[PDB]
Design an enzyme around this catalytic site. Sequence first.
Site, PDB file in Angstrom:
ATOM      1  N   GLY A 252      66.362  42.434  71.544  1.00 18.53           N
ATOM      2  CA  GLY A 252      67.499  42.799  72.372  1.00 18.53           C
ATOM      3  C   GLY A 252      66.938  43.431  73.628  1.00 18.53           C
ATOM      4  O   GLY A 252      65.924  44.144  73.576  1.00 18.53           O
TER       5      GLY A 252
ATOM      6  N   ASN B  83      64.064  46.208  74.256  1.00 19.93           N
ATOM      7  CA  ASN B  83      62.823  45.778  74.919  1.00 19.93           C
ATOM      8  C   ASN B  83      62.476  46.655  76.127  1.00 19.93           C
ATOM      9  O   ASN B  83      61.360  47.162  76.228  1.00 19.93           O
ATOM     10  CB  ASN B  83      62.907  44.301  75.339  1.00 19.93           C
TER      11      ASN B  83
ATOM     12  N   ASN C 254      65.499  35.613  87.837  1.00 13.51           N
ATOM     13  CA  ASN C 254      64.364  34.752  88.129  1.00 13.51           C
ATOM     14  C   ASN C 254      64.727  33.792  89.249  1.00 13.51           C
ATOM     15  O   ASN C 254      65.895  33.710  89.639  1.00 13.51           O
ATOM     16  CB  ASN C 254      63.856  34.026  86.875  1.00 13.51           C
TER      17      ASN C 254
ATOM     18  N   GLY D 157      54.214  35.392  90.376  1.00 14.13           N
ATOM     19  CA  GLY D 157      54.504  36.728  90.884  1.00 14.13           C
ATOM     20  C   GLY D 157      55.975  37.082  90.916  1.00 14.13           C
ATOM     21  O   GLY D 157      56.744  36.673  90.045  1.00 14.13           O
TER      22      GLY D 157
ATOM     23  N   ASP E 187      61.589  41.694  80.100  1.00  8.07           N
ATOM     24  CA  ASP E 187      62.081  43.022  79.781  1.00  8.07           C
ATOM     25  C   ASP E 187      61.000  44.075  79.996  1.00  8.07           C
ATOM     26  O   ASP E 187      61.298  45.222  80.341  1.00  8.07           O
ATOM     27  CB  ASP E 187      62.640  43.050  78.365  1.00  8.07           C
TER      28      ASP E 187
END
Lengths: 303, 313
Positions: free
Chosen positions: A47, A51, A191, A224, A252
Site C-alpha cells: 500500500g 510504502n 510519471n 531520472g 513510493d
Amino acid sequence: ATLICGSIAYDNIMTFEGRFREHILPDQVHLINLSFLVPTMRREFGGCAGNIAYALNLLGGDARMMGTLGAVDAQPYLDRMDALGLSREYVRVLPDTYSAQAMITTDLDNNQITAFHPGAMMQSHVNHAGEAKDIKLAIVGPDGFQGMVQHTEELAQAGVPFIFDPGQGLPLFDGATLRRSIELATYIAVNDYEAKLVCDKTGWSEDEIASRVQALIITRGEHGATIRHRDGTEQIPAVRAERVIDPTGCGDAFRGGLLYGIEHGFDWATAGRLASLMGALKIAHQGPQTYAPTRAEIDARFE
Amino acid sequence: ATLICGSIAYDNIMTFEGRFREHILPDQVHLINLSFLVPTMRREFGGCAGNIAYALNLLGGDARMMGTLGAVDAQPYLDRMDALGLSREYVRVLPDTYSAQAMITTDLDNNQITAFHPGAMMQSHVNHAGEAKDIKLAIVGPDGFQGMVQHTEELAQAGVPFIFDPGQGLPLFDGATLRRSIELATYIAVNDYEAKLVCDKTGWSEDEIASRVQALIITRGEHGATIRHRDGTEQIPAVRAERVIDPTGCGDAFRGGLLYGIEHGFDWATAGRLASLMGALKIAHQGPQTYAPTRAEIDARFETAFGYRPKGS
C-alpha cells in the site's frame, strides 16, 4: 508532521508446489476443485501509505499514515508499525472487513493467478484529513476513490500543503474532478506517461497545470526525474543502482525521499536527488519494504 | 458419541466473475497470468471437522470435534461451538499460531481453487484419538498429515470403527501409508476422482479396495453416490437442490448424514440417501454451515425425494 494519505495493503504471496494445468478435470464442463497447502505463505507489506511512510521513516522523518485496515487482518501491520516506531493515530481498523490485499499464487512452471480485493481501502474516507493535529505537509496517493477526493478537499480546507499523486487511481478521474484536484493541490507527482494522461484528460497543457501548483514532479524512472517550479526546471539524474531485483515500490521510495526534502530545508535539486536515490536503494531488494538502509548509508550514497 | 477428526478452519470465500476453464487449459503452453478483481470476500466457519460436526449436530447426533485451532484467532469459533452445543473437549488451541485459513475462489461454474494456510492444523497430532471417551464411531478427514495417520492408528488400536476420508489430504500419502490407512479403516468415503487417485496410488482396483473395508462410499457430485458394501452395490440418486448457491462444504454435509445413518442402524441405501439429501440442503445456502433445517424439514424433504421416511433398523 507529514500526513501520508494512501492505501494500506498486504500482498499474500503463495506458492503452489504443483501445476495448475494438471488439475483441470475432464467433466462435461471442465471441473476444477483444487486445494493445496501453503505452509510458507509470505506476507509482503504494501500500500502506498505504508510504502512512503516506511521510506520517510528510514530518512529520520516523522511519518503519519492515514489509511484503513480490516479488523479481520489488521494485526500484522499494526505490529510492524509499532516495531518501526510509526504512529497509528490515523490508521483506522474497520470491523467485518478485510484489509486491501492481493492474492498471488504461482505454480512450479511459473503460471500465476492474481486476485485483488480492495477491502478496507474502499472506506478510507472515514478518516478526515482536516480533523487532525500538527501537520505541515501531506501526500494523497492511490486509495479508495472517495478517500482520495475527500483528502484533497480537507487538506486544502485546513490549509495543508499537499502532493497530489493520483497514480493508478487516475483512470477513475473525469475531466472535472481532475481539474479540481490540481487547483487544490500544492504539488503534483506523476510519471511521464500519467503527466500525458492528465494533459489529455483535463485538456490543459503542461504549462497550464504547472501554473496551478508550486511544483510539477514528473518521474522518468530509469532516465531520472523532472521538477517544474516557479523559477524553472530541475533536471534530476537517475541514480545508479547496485542491482535490479524488484521495481515494485520504487515510486513510493521516491516519494518518501521527496517528502523529506519539502518538510526539511532542501531545495528542489537536492530533494529531487533524494527522491531519485530512494528509488535506486529499494530496487536492489525484493518487495516494497525490505531494503533497510540506515540514514548514514543514505547520505554516503548521496555523495 | 461420534468423534470427528479433521481440520477446523476459517473459510475466506471469494468470487471470480469468470471461468477458470477459460484461462487454465492443459493443452495450452503459454505462462498463465490470470488477473482478476474480487469485490467480495466472505468470512465463514469451515474446516472438515467443523462442517461434518455441524451436519451431524443438525440431525440430532452427538458430534465431538477433534482438531486444533490457533490462539490468535480461535475465539469466535469457540464461541460458536458453545452456541451450537458442540463439546470442545477435543478442540485444542495452540499459542502464537493462527487457525487454519482457506483462501477459496469460486467461479461462475462453481469450480474452485483453494490455497490452504494450515497454521495450527500442522500440530493436530497433539490430540490423541485413542484417549477420546465414549466413542462408538469416528471419521478421519482432511487434516495435518501427521494427525491423520496418528488418528488412524489410534482409533484402530482402540477398536473404534472409523471412516477414512483422505479428501484434499490425499496427495500427502504415499502408497504404503495409503494402503495401511485403508486396511485399518472400517469405511472409506471419497469423491469419484479421488477414488481413481486411491486406485492409482495403492495399485489396488476399486474391487480390491472395496473388499478391504465394510463399505467404499464414492460421491459423484450432482449424480449422487455409490456405496459398495459386502452384499452388493447401492446407487444413491442425487437430490435436486432447491437452488444452487455455494458448493463449499457439500461433501462434509454428506459425511454428516452418512455418520448419522451408520450410528442409528440405517441400511446403506437409506444412509446414502440421507447423506445425499444433506448435500443438497447445504448447497442452497452460502457457506458450509449456514443451512439450519429442522429435523422435521430433513424428514419431509427425505420422503419427497426418495418415497419413504428414513428409519433405523
